[PDB]
Design an enzyme around this catalytic site. Sequence first.
Site, PDB file in Angstrom:
ATOM      1  N   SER A 145       0.870  -1.381   0.046  1.00  0.00           N
ATOM      2  CA  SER A 145      -0.092   0.214   0.162  1.00  0.00           C
ATOM      3  C   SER A 145       0.642   1.128   0.093  1.00  0.00           C
ATOM      4  CB  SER A 145      -0.828  -0.155   1.108  1.00  0.00           C
ATOM      5  OG  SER A 145      -1.686  -1.519   0.918  1.00  0.00           O
ATOM      6  N   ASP A 249      -8.175  -2.906  -7.768  1.00  0.00           N
ATOM      7  CA  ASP A 249      -7.717  -2.528  -6.331  1.00  0.00           C
ATOM      8  C   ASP A 249      -8.529  -1.649  -5.622  1.00  0.00           C
ATOM      9  OD1 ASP A 249      -5.104  -2.295  -4.413  1.00  0.00           O
ATOM     10  OD2 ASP A 249      -6.074  -0.464  -4.393  1.00  0.00           O
ATOM     11  N   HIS A 295      -8.243  -5.757  -1.461  1.00  0.00           N
ATOM     12  CA  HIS A 295      -7.242  -4.809  -0.754  1.00  0.00           C
ATOM     13  C   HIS A 295      -6.327  -5.723   0.074  1.00  0.00           C
ATOM     14  CE1 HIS A 295     -10.582  -5.615   2.617  1.00  0.00           C
ATOM     15  NE2 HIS A 295      -9.492  -5.840   3.250  1.00  0.00           N
TER      16      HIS A 295
END
EC number: 3.1.1.98
Length: 350
Positions: A145, A249, A295
């Site tokens: 991330s 995503d 995620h």
Amino acid sequence: DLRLHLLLNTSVTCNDGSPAGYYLKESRGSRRWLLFLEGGWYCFNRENCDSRYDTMRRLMSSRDWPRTRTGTGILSSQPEENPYWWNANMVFIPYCSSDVWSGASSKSEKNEYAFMGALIIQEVVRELLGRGLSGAKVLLLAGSSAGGTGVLLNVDRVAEQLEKLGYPAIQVRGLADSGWFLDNKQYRHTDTITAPTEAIRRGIRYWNGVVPERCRRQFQEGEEWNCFFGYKVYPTLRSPVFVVQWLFDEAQLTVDNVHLPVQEGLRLYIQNLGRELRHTLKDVPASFAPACLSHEIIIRSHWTDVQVKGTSLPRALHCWDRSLHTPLKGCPVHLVDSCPWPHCNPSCPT
Ligand SMILES: CC(=O)NCCc1c[nH]c2ccc(F)cc12
Ligand SMILES: CC(=O)NCCc1c[nH]c2ccc(F)cc12
Ligand SMILES: *[C@@H]1O[C@H](CO)[C@@H](O)[C@H](O)[C@H]1NC(C)=O
């Protein structure tokens, strides 16, 4: 378990001036080192950072950190959970600078918070050299991330640091998970909640953010926000980088103002997003990009389950290692799905 070490140079700090740190598990029979960058969004002004300090304080301070953490996924030492690098020296670097790992500014009479992400990485590397890193053959800088974007921003700086310190034999590589975003047209558009490019632009000024020098010279002053987008910074990098990114995503869709009966307009938007992501990866030889809405990240314990064209991510990473010793028979490293809708791959996370 990985054991906490607070930085001996206590001027390298989290947002609130407490010392930054790292969690370490040594493997004395191994010359491989994995340094993992945690993620968790960012903050870009006083009011927005003040909010984060009230309800996300572990991402701004080390005052409440635990003495140990358990390594999971690619950070696990069990071969059953981590077929790739289970015997490596493992390092987890907590994200406590709220700056996508880009900052180089101290708390001062003019600065309520410190933004030192780039300096935290450098200081961790420096202190590990006295704990065995001086003997490494490979240093893999990985992250998820905001930490995945952090890999792209910092991997060449780590390579330069080790060369200047006198360790030219350590091979520095990067693994960027879920940090490869598009500055695309949003599905619906319009304070904080109302675009990412403008928030990053303001953030860079607030943090005194730094980007890789070759990318900086292309885009020039005022336009450094471009280097936070993988497809623009990747071509400027010299260290080998493996890119992991879901085609759909969840963070990308959130900032595009999509929240999942899908009608024609939204159907075409989602399909176009997948095709654009796949297009940005066509010239990335080491990549893993499944057609999933997710995620989930590579430190999860079931990371081995997803496959593209019948090959798992731990396998693809092993084939990448072999490639850095011309394709390899049955050992692929470029794995991008071509089907056009989330979960058209049956191996996607449940
Ligand atoms: C999800 C999003 O806003 N993506 C566009 C801005 C951006 C680029 N790299 C990032 C890393 C972490 C993060 F939170 C945002 C970004
Ligand atoms: C994720 C993200 O930040 N996307 C927005 C990028 C953007 C800002 N201004 C625009 C104008 C036209 C356009 F096509 C895209 C943009
Ligand atoms: C601590 O880190 C800062 C920031 O990189 C550096 O300027 C300073 O020289 C360091 N102090 C020591 C004693 O190494």
